[PDB]
Amino acid sequence: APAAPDKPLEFKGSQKTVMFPHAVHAKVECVTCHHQVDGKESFAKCGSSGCHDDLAGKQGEKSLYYVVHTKKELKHTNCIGCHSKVVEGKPELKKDLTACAKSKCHP
Numbered sequence: 001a002p003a004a005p006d007k008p009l010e011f012k013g014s015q016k017t018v019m020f021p022h023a024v025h026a027k028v029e030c031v032t033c034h035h036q037v038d039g040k041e042s043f044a045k046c047g048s049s050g051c052h053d054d055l056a057g058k059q060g061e062k063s064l065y066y067v068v069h070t071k072k073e074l075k076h077t078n079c080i081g082c083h084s085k086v087v088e089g090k091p092e093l094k095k096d097l098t099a100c101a102k103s104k105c106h107p
């Protein structure tokens with residue numbers, strides 16, 4: 001598989017840009033986020049054509065917003081989902097990892 005990016009990268013929606021750092025997630029297997037597609041590995045951008053390419057809508061499988069933010073139980077692990085589990089044991093990180101404003105995702 002390709003190498004994991006060294007520097008934080010721009011993970012964009014239609015209005016906001018969130019800096020995503022791989023370094024901090026080094027203990028997380030790649031596939032956790034870069035889920036398999038049709039039985040094969042995939043490292044394409046989440047919102048590329050044919051994937052979660054609805055960058056404005058907030059509901060549905062095609063919605064990038066939805067797969068990133070929903071707390072519902074999904075087929076694959078997502079951003080808010082794992083962060084919520086993490087803060088159950090580390091409450092001191094609740095604001096930094098799950099808050100809608102003033103968090104590490106949305107400063």
Ligand code: HEM
Pocket residue numbers: 011012013014015016017018055056064065066068069079080083097098099100101103105106
């Ligand atoms: C808290 C539950 C929370 C809210 C609400 C929220 C809102 C939000 C908006 C309105 C956008 C802009 C969408 C767009 O540009 O089209 C947005 C985008 C991203 N967010 Fe968010 N967000 C909340 C929380 C968090 C947290 C705690 C993280 C990080 C784990 C996070 C991540 C992202 C990412 C990535 C984006 C860009 C991709 C996209 O969803 O379009 N948000 N968020």
Ligand code: HEM
Pocket residue numbers: 001002003004005009010011012020022025028029030031032033034043044045046047048
């Ligand atoms: C595991 C060690 C791992 C690899 C390999 C990896 C690779 C990778 C690449 C090459 C990109 C760049 C994609 C591009 O076309 O620019 C990329 C981007 C993102 N990754 Fe990743 N990644 C690995 C692990 C992880 C883990 C564990 C997560 C989630 C916690 C994750 C997530 C992301 C996100 C988000 C992006 C941005 C994609 C976008 O649409 O902008 N990666 N990764």
Ligand code: HEM
Pocket residue numbers: 033034035036037042043044045046047048050051052061067068073074075076077078
């Ligand atoms: C990019 C790193 C990336 C993220 C983030 C992402 C998340 C995601 C979640 C959490 C699910 C489960 C949704 C649900 O259960 O309702 C999910 C599902 C699918 N994805 Fe995805 N996804 C990322 C990347 C990609 C890419 C690059 C494509 C397109 C090639 C893609 C496609 C799909 C499809 C289709 C589904 C539904 C089938 C499934 O595997 O669950 N995603 N994604």
Ligand code: HEM
Pocket residue numbers: 011018019020021024025028032033077078079080082083086093097104105
């Ligand atoms: C989903 C693609 C996703 C995003 C977006 C995301 C963002 C994020 C940020 C911005 C941080 C803070 C970095 C900093 O300290 O400056 C962060 C930190 C942790 N994350 Fe995350 N994260 C996403 C996904 C995931 C997933 C799927 C998991 C769990 C499997 C996960 C876990 C963590 C953990 C652990 C941290 C570090 C907490 C700490 O001790 O500081 N993230 N994430």
